[PDB]
Amino acid sequence: MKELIYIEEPKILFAHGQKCTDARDGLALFGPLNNLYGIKSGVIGTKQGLKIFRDYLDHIQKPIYNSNSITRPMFPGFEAVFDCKWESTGITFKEVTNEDIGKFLYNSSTHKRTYDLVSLFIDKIISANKNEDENVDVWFVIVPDEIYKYCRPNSVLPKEMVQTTYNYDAQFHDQFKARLLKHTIPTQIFRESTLAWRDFKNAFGLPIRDFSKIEGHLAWTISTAAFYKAGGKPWKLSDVRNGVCYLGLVYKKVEKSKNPRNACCAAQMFLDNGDGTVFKGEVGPWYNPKNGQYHLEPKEAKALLSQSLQSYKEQIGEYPKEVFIHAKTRFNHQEWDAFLEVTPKETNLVGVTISKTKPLKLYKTEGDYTILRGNAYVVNERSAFLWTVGYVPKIQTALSMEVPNPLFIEINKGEADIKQVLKDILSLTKLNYNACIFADGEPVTLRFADKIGEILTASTDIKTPPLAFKYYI
Amino acid sequence: MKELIYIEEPKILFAHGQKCTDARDGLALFGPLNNLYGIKSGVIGTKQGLKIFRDYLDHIQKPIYNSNSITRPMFPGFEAVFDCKWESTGITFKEVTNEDIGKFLYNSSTHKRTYDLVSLFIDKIISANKNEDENVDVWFVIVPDEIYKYCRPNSVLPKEMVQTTYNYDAQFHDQFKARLLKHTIPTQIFRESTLAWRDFKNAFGLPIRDFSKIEGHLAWTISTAAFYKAGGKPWKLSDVRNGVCYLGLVYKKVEKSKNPRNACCAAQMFLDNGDGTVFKGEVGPWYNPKNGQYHLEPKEAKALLSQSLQSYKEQIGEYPKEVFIHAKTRFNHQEWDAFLEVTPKETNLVGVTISKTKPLKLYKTEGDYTILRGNAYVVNERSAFLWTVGYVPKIQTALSMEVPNPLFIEINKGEADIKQVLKDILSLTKLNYNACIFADGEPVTLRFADKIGEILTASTDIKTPPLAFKYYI
Amino acid sequence: EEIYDSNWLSILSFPEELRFHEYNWMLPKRFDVRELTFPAVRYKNYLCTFAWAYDFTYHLPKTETYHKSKTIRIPTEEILSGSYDSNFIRNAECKRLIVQLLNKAFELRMKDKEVQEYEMSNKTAYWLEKGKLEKDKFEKTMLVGKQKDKNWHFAISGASKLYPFPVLMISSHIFFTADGKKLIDSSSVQHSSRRRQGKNWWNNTWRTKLLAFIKYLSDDDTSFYLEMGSEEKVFVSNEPVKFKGNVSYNI
Amino acid sequence: EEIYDSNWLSILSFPEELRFHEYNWMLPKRFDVRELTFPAVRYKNYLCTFAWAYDFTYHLPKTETYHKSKTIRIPTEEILSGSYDSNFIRNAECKRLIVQLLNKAFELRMKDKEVQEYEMSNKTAYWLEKGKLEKDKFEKTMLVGKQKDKNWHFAISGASKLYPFPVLMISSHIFFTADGKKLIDSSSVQHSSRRRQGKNWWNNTWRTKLLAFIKYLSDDDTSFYLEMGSEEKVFVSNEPVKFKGNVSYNI
DNA sequence: ATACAACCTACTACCTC
RNA sequence: UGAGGUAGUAGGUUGUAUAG
DNA sequence: ATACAACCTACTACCTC
RNA sequence: UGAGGUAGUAGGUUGUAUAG
C-alpha cells in the first residue's frame, strides 16, 4: 500500500474576474476575457465547398444540443458565448475552380502535387491580403475529401485515375501553414467531411464521420479556434506565481536535409505586469545534428535560454525568479551547464522531464470506471506519476477511453519542489486554446511546441517566424 | 463671347443603394457601404502622446459642431456615421520612452536620425504584429512636434541642442510607410498638434494650429481615413460605364540612385461584375532613366498596360472595351505605339493629359464669388478646360480661396468624346477616400498615383508592393 | 445666362507680313538681339521680325547696304491658320517665333510706359510706383495701397499664346515695398506679405484691379498696341475675352 | 479512502548472490547465451547469472573443469540498495544486468507453462490457446472468447524494472486468431479487431482478466517463481502492488 | 553652351476645410 | 504627414537657331 | 556489427469528445 | 488537418560487453 496524493483542480479566469474549472462552462456563462467586435472571415475553396461552410456557420449561429448534456455541455451559439459577431454575411470568398483543383491533384508525385495544391490556395490568400481592401481576421480554407486522401505522405494514388518541390513536406496542412508565416495570416483548414457531413455517406448509408451525438462539442472546438485565431482571449490562468517563466522544449525530425537535424522548438509561458498571462512561442529553431541526439549543444542552449530570459525582461523589466523548463526528453549535463551559464544568480533553473512511456496503470477495485484525474503517486522528492488523463465528475466520465497512462514527471535537473511542479503541470494542462476541452492530457507548452515544430519542419526557407500561436494553431 | 458648358454633378452611391453629391452628407445620413463590426486600434508613441489620442478619440465619440453648419456639416460622431465600434477601450499601446525618442533625435545628420526614428516605431509595430495575440486593424502612430521640426528635408537643427541610412528618404512619413509595406500594416501618422492642439500655444497664447472653427471637418477627415484603413467601403461611384478601365500615371524623382530614374506609378479604377467599384493601385514601378524624360520606354509601357489589362480580365473575365489613361504629362508616339501593341483590337485606348498650368481665370462680372464648379470651356473636340475647383451651392462657398485655376484636359492620344471625358474626370474627382471633402480638385487616379510614387521613392529595397490603397493613404 | 471676364486679351490684328531679313554678315554674331529697339529673333542667318529692314540702323550701322529683295516675308494669316509649312520654317516653330516677338514687344512696351519691374523665378512682373498715379487709384479702383509698414502694389505679367486664339494671358500678383520705391529683398517676407494681403481679396478685388491696370496700359478706348517696328503695330484689345455660361447662382 | 490495483507485481525475493563465473575459454565465443537453460549474460569474460557454476554443463561440456573460487559473486542487496560500485562493475550497469536476467527468466518461465506466443514490434506477448483452459475461463473471468469469425485471446507482456521498487510491469493486449490456433498475419486486421474488442472493455473487464492471467501463472497462493538456476528462484508476487488514494467518487 | 517657347518635378510658406 | 486650396521660390527637359 | 536495457521520433488505425 | 484519447506497426539512439 503506497500513498497517492491528489492535486486540487486548477482554476482558470474568465470575464469579470470569474473562476471555473471547465473552459466550456466558463465560456458559456461568463464569456471571454477581451472584446472582439466581430470576426471578418475569408473563405477560400470550391463554390460547392463555400455552400457547406455557409450552412455550417448558420448552424453554429443557433444554440446546438448534443446527446448527453451532462457529459458534454450544449453549445449556446457563437454570439451568445463569445459576445462577438461572426456572421455568414461579410465573408470574403475566393473560388477555387474544380478544374484547377483537379489539374494538380491527378499527379503521380506526391511532393509536387502537394506543393502545387498548397500554392493554389496560398497565392489567392496572399493576393487577397495584399491587393484587396477587404479586412479579414481568419482565412478559413476548405479542402475536398479526395484531396485529403491524395495529399499526404504514404498516399498511394489509384492507377486508373492518374493523369500527370521535394524540399517541402508531403503533407498539405503543415506546408500550408509554413508558407504563410511571412505574411502572418491566421488560417483554419476544414475538410468537407469535418463540415456538413450528412451528405458524405458510406456504402451502408450512414455518414462516415457520423457526428450525430457530438455536434455540440464539434461546434465548441470550431468556435473556440475561430475566436482565438481572430485575436481573442478565451480564458487565462489564475494560479501562476509571480516571477516564474516556464518554457517547454520539443524536438522534431527534418527529412528535407540529409540527417534529420533534430529541430528544437520552445513555447514560453509566464505572467505579465498586472495580471495578464503571456503564452507564446519561443521560436529560434536551433537545429541539432546527429541522427538521434535530441540534446542541445552549448551554443544553441545558450541562445535559447538567453532569448527566453530577454523576452521575459523586455515585458516585465527584471529577470525571472524561477524557470521551470519542460521537455519530453531528459536533459544531459552539457546543455544544463550551458543553460546555467546564461542564467543569472537570482534566477532558479529547474529541468523537468515529462513522458508517457512508463507502464503504470491503476485499475480501481470495483466499478467500470478509471482513476480520478489529478491523483499523483510521488515516487520521491524528485519523481512522481501524475494522472492528467482520468476521471473528473463535471464531465461525468473520464477523459480517456481505456485505462489511461499517467504522466511521469521527473525533476531531471535543478532542485524544485515536486508538489509544486505537479501543481503547475496540471495548471498547464488547461490552456489548450486549439481544443475547447475540460483539460489536456499533456502540458500545453509541450503540445504547442510540438505543433510549432511540426509546422516549421515543413518549410526550409523560413526566417524569423512569428511567436504568436494563432499563426500555427 | 465663347460658349461655356456645364457638366452635371456626378452622384456617388451609399448604403441601401442611395445617392448624394456630398460625401459628408451621404455618410452622415445613409452610412457606408459595408459593415465593419469594429475597429481595433493600435497606438504607438509616448505615454504623454497616448493621453492626447485617448482624449481626441473620446472627443470624436460624441457629435461635434463647427462654426457654420451650412458651409461645413457638423460631425455626428463615429459610431453614428460609420455604424462601427471604434472605442478608446481595446487599443493596443506601445510606449515610446522620451529618452529613446530624444536619443536619436538630437543628431546632426538628418538621414541617419530619420532612419533611426522610423526604425524605433516600425520595429515595435512589426513585433506587435508578429509576436502578439492582439488583433489591430490600424496602427495609429503619434509623433511629437519637435520631431516634425527635425525629421524632414532642409530641417536645420539648432546648434545649441546638438548631441550626436542615406539610401532612404530624409522624410519621416514617406520612409515610415515605405518600410512597412512588406508586412501590410495600415498606419496613420498624427502630429501632437493635429490631435489636441489647445495645449500647444504660441507667444501670443492662441494655439498655433487653431482649429476652433473647424473641429467638425477635422474629425470628419480623421474618421473617414480611419474607416478606410480598417477595411471599410465609405462610398462608391454610380456613373461608371461598363467595360471601362481607367488607369492614371504619375512620375516621381528618385534622388537615392544617381539620375532621378523617374519612377512611374499607376492607379487603376474600373467596374466589377455586378455593381462593385474596383479602385486600387497598379504598382510595378517602371523606372525611367534620363534626368527629365517623363516618358515610358516601349518595354515598360508594354509591361504596365499588360499588367493593367490582365488585372481587369482576372476580375471581370474579358478585356476592357475602352481604357482612358490619365497623366499629368503628355504622351509621345513611342509609348502610345507600345500601349497599342499590347491593347487588343476590341479595346479602345484613349490618352488624356491633365494639367493646371494654363493661365486661364474667369472672374465673374459682379459679386465677390468665383465661378461655379463643373463649368467647362470646350476649346475643341480634343481639348477643354474644366473647373473642378469652383463654387458649389451645397458647401455654401467655393472649394478654393482665390480665383481657381481650371484643369486643362486634352485628349493627347486616341479619339474619345470630349464631353464624356469631362464627365468621367469630374466623377473621378469624387472618390478621395483620404479626405472627406465634397470633391477633389484633381482626378483621384492622379492623386493616389502621386501618393504611391511618393511613398515608393523613399525605400530602395521594395519588392512586389501591395496594390491596396490603405497601405499608402 | 452669366457672363464671365477672363484674363485673356484678344490680339485684334497682326502685321501683314512676318519678315526674315538676310542680315548675315551685316549682323555681327557676338551681338544680342535684345538691345535692338524692336523685337527680333536670330533664326538661321535670318533675323525674324515684324519690323522694316532698316529699323535697326542705329544699333546696326553695317546694315545700311542691306537689299530688301532678300526678305522671305510670310503672310501671317497663313501662319496663324496653319497653311504655311516648308523646309525653311515649320508651322510649329514659326508660331513659336511670333510668340517670342509678342512677348518681347510686351516687355518693351511695359518698359516704355515707365512701370517698375520685379523679377520672379521665371517671369517678370510690372508694378506701379507710389505716386505714379493720382493718389494711386486708376479708374475708381485703387492699385497701390498700404499694409502696416509695407506699401503694396498690384502687378501683372504677360504671356502671348496662339493655341486657343491669338491671345495675351495676364497673371496678377501683389508686390511689397519698404518705402514705396525700393523692393524688399527677402523672398519669404514678400511671400508672407502677399498671402496676408490676398487673404481678403475676393473676386471683384482681383477682377477690378486687373481691368484697371489693363485700362491704364490702354492707348485708346478699345485697345493698346505693341510696337513691332517703325510702321507695324500689334493691337491687343484692352477688353478681355468674355465667356458666357448658361448656369449661375445667387447668395 | 480508495484502494487501487496496479499492474506491477512485487518481486518478493532475490537470490543471495549475483554470480559472475569466469568461464573464459570454457565458453566458446561463437555461442549465444539464449540457448542456455538458465538466464545468463556475457559480461567481459564473465558469465553473469544467478545460477550455480555447473548448471550449464549440458550446453557447455567444456565447463566441467571450472573452478568455483573464480566467481566474484555479489551481495544482491547491496546492488539493489546501491552500495556496490567499482571498476569491475558499475551500479548503473549492474542493475541493468539483473533486469535482463529477470526478463529472460520471465520469457523462459512463460515458455515452460506452454502459452502461445505472438511477437510485437518490440516486445513479445503470451496468449492462451483455445481449449487450453477449461472452457477458456480461469477463475470466474473468461480469458478467451469469440467475436464474429475471430477467436480473441487475452495476452500479457512482462518487463522487469528496479527504479521505484524491484517490480515486474505487465502490459495487457488482445490477440485474434482465425481458427483458435493460428494467428492472423495481417497487422492492420489485428489492430482493427483489437480496437473493436476493446471498444467495450471497461475497468473491471481489464483488471479482472489481468488478475486472472496472473493467478493462472501462479504456483502457490501467494506468488510464482522464475527459475534463476538449479537452486535459485526469484519469487514474484501474484498480488499486484496496491495504491491507496484519499479521494474517490461515485456514479 | 547661349537665347527662346512650351513642358516637367521638388520644396517652402500661408490659408483654408 | 487629419486635409484640401492658393502662392512664391529652386531646378530641369524637349524642340529649334547661331556659336565652341 | 551482434546481444541487451533504458530512451527517442514518425506513421497508421480506431474510438471518442 | 474541428478535436482529444487509446492501439499497433516501423525505425532510431545512448550506454555497456564480447567479437571484426
Q: Do C245 and B366 touch (CB under 8 A)?
A: no
To 10 degrees, what angle do helices A444-456 and A172-179 make? Answer: 80
For chain A, domains (ranges, CATH) are: 34-229 (3.40.50.2300), 239-471 (3.30.420.10)
Cell of A60: 453554429
- Residues of A at the D interface, defined by Cβ within 8 angstroms: 1-6, 359-372, 375, 377, 379, 391, 393, 402-403
Phi, psi of C156 (to 5 degrees): -130, 155
Which one, of B38, B44, B188, B53, lies nearest residue B129 by Cα? B44
DSSP one-letter string for B139-151? EEEEE-HHHHHSS
Q: Is A94 left (phi over 0), alpha (psi -120 to 50) or beta?
A: beta
Q: Do D2 and A369 touch (CB under 8 A)?
A: no
DSSP B355: E
DSSP run (H or E) holding D32: none
Q: Is D196 helix (H, G, I), strand (E, B) or coil?
A: helix
CA dist., res. D94 & res. D113, Å (int): 29
DSSP one-letter string for B28-44? HHT--SS---B--EEEE
Q: Find how far residue A201's CA is from the centre of its chain.
A: 30
Nearest amino-acid residue to H10, taking CA and C1': D121
What are the C-alpha distances in Å from B445 to residues A309, B234, C110, D132?
51, 17, 43, 91
D/A touch flag: 3 or more CB pairs below 8 Å: yes
DSSP run (H or E) holding D199: none
Chains A, D: CB contacts within 8 A come to 81
CA dist., res. D6 & res. D8, Å (int): 5
Resolution (A): 2.9
Nearest amino-acid residue to H3, taking CA and C1': A435
Nearest amino-acid residue to E8, taking CA and C1': B292
Number of H helices, E strands in chain B: 12, 20
User: How many other C-beta atoms are found inside a 10 Å radius of the C-beta of residue D167?
Assistant: 22
Q: Do A470 and B133 touch (CB under 8 A)?
A: yes
DSSP run (H or E) holding B216: helix B215-229
Nearest amino-acid residue to G16, taking CA and C1': A401
CA dist., res. C156 & res. C167, Å (int): 15
Q: Which residue has the cell 517563466?
A: A245
CA dist., res. A466 & res. B454, Å (int): 30
Q: Do B375 and C245 touch (CB under 8 A)?
A: yes
Q: Which residue has the cell 491507496?
A: D244
Contacts of B154 in chain C (CB under 8 A): none
Nucleotides of strand E under 7 angstroms from a protein beta carbon: 4-17
Nearest amino-acid residue to H13, taking CA and C1': A292
To 10 degrees, what angle do helices B47-61 and B215-229 make? Answer: 100
Q: Do D7 and A361 touch (CB under 8 A)?
A: yes
CA of B464 to C1' of F19 (A): 50
What are the C-alpha distances in Å from D171 to residues B235, D157, D159, D207, D211?
70, 5, 8, 11, 12
Q: Is residue B473 a known part of a binding site?
A: yes
Q: Where does B148-276 show beta strands of DSSP type E?
A: 187-191, 236-237, 244-245, 248-252, 263-271
In the beta sheet, which residues pair with residue D175? D153
Reduced 3-state DSSP string for chain A: CEEEEECCCCCEEEHHHEEECCHHHHHHHCCCCCCCCECCEEEEECHHHHHHHHHHHHHHHCCECCCCCCCCCCECCHHHHHCCECCCCCCEEEECCHHHHHHCCCCCCHHHHHHHHHHHHHHHHHHHHHCCCCCCCEEEEEECHHHHHCCCCCCCCCHHHCCCCCCECCCHHHHHHHHCCCCCCCEEEEECCCCCCCCCECCCCCECCCCCCCHHHHHHHHHHHHHHHCCCCCCEECCCCCCEECCEEEEECCCCCCCCCCEEEEEEEEECCCCCEEEEEEEEEEECCCCCCCCCCHHHHHHHHHHHHHHHHHHHCCCCCEEEEEECCCCCHHHHHHHHHHCCCCCEEEEEEEECCCCCCCEECCCCCCCECCEEEEEECCEEEECCCCEEHHHCEECCCCCCCCEEEEEEECCCCHHHHHHHHHHHCCCCCCCCCCCCCCCHHHHHHHHHHHHHCCECCCCCCCCCHHHCC
What per-residue string of b and e applies to D80-107 under the rule 16 or more CB within 10 Å gives b? beeebeeeebebeebbebbbebbbbbbb
To 10 degrees, what angle do helices B333-342 and B298-316 make? Answer: 40
* Substitution target from B33, B34, B37, B224 for chain A, most A beta carbons within 10 A: B37
In the beta sheet, which residues pair with residue B413? B351
Q: Which of C6, C198, C248 sits opposite B360 (nearest CB)?
A: C6
Q: Is B335 helix (H, G, I), strand (E, B) or coil?
A: helix
Cell of B4: 461655356
Contacts of B467 in chain A (CB under 8 A): 130-131
Contacts of A33 (CB under 8 A, 6+ apart): A13, A14, A15, A232, A233, A234, A235, A236
Q: Which nucleotide lies nearest residue A457, CA to C1'?
A: G10
Q: Residue B126's closest chain A neighbor by CA?
A: A466
Long-range contact set of residues B330-337: C-beta below 8 Å, sequence gap at least 24: B330/B410, B330/B412, B331/B295, B331/B412, B331/B413, B332/B295, B334/B295, B334/B297, B334/B298, B335/B295, B335/B296, B335/B297, B335/B298, B335/B301, B336/B413, B337/B298
Q: Do A135 and B133 touch (CB under 8 A)?
A: no
Q: Is D29 helix (H, G, I), strand (E, B) or coil?
A: coil
Contacts of C241 in chain B (CB under 8 A): 2
CA dist., res. B7 & res. B448, Å (int): 24
How deeply is C48 buried, as exposed, middle or buried, from its count of CB atoms within 10 A (0-12, 13-18, 19+)?
buried
What are the C-alpha distances in Å from B263 to residues A49, B260, B385, D162?
43, 8, 28, 77
Q: How far is B142 from chain A (nearest CA, A)?
A: 22
What are the C-alpha distances in Å from D210 to residues A224, A362, D195?
41, 12, 18
CA dist., res. C162 & res. A30, Å (int): 80
What are the C-alpha distances in Å from B317 to residues A131, B267, B272, B310, D197?
18, 20, 10, 9, 58
DSSP run (H or E) holding B119: helix B110-130
For residues A104 and A116, is the Cβ–Cβ distance under 8 A?
A: yes
Contacts of A39 in chain B (CB under 8 A): 37
Phi, psi of B360 (to 5 degrees): -105, 135
Q: Find how far residue A380's CA is from the centre of its chain.
A: 32
Cell of D75: 551481495
CA dist., res. B246 & res. A97, Å (int): 29
Name the experimental technique: cryo-EM
Q: Is residue A434 a known part of a binding site?
A: yes
Cell of B239: 456613373
Q: Do A367 and D251 touch (CB under 8 A)?
A: yes
DSSP B10: P
Q: Which nucleotide lies nearest residue A408, CA to C1'?
A: G7
Nucleotides of strand H under 7 angstroms from a protein beta carbon: 1-19
For residues B110 and B14, is the Cβ–Cβ distance under 8 A?
A: no
Q: How far is A176 from chain B (nearest CA, A)?
A: 18
Q: Residue B358's closest chain C neighbor by CA?
A: C169
To 10 degrees, what angle do helices A47-61 and A215-229 make? Answer: 100
Q: How far is A261 from chain D (nearest CA, A)?
A: 26
How deeply is C81 buried, as exposed, middle or buried, from its count of CB atoms within 10 A (0-12, 13-18, 19+)?
exposed
For residues A259 and A449, is the Cβ–Cβ distance under 8 A?
A: no
Q: Is B70 helix (H, G, I), strand (E, B) or coil?
A: coil
- Alpha carbons within 13 angstroms on the beta-carbon side of residue D28 total 8
Q: Do A135 and B230 touch (CB under 8 A)?
A: yes
Q: Which nucleotide lies nearest residue A68, CA to C1'?
A: G17
Which one, of B316, B293, B294, B297, lies nearest residue B305 by Cα? B297
Reduced 3-state DSSP string for D109-174: HHHHCCCEEEECCCCEEEECCCCCCCCCEECCEECEEEECCEEEEEEEEEEEECCCCCEEEEEEEE
CA dist., res. C218 & res. C236, Å (int): 9
Cell of D190: 489485428
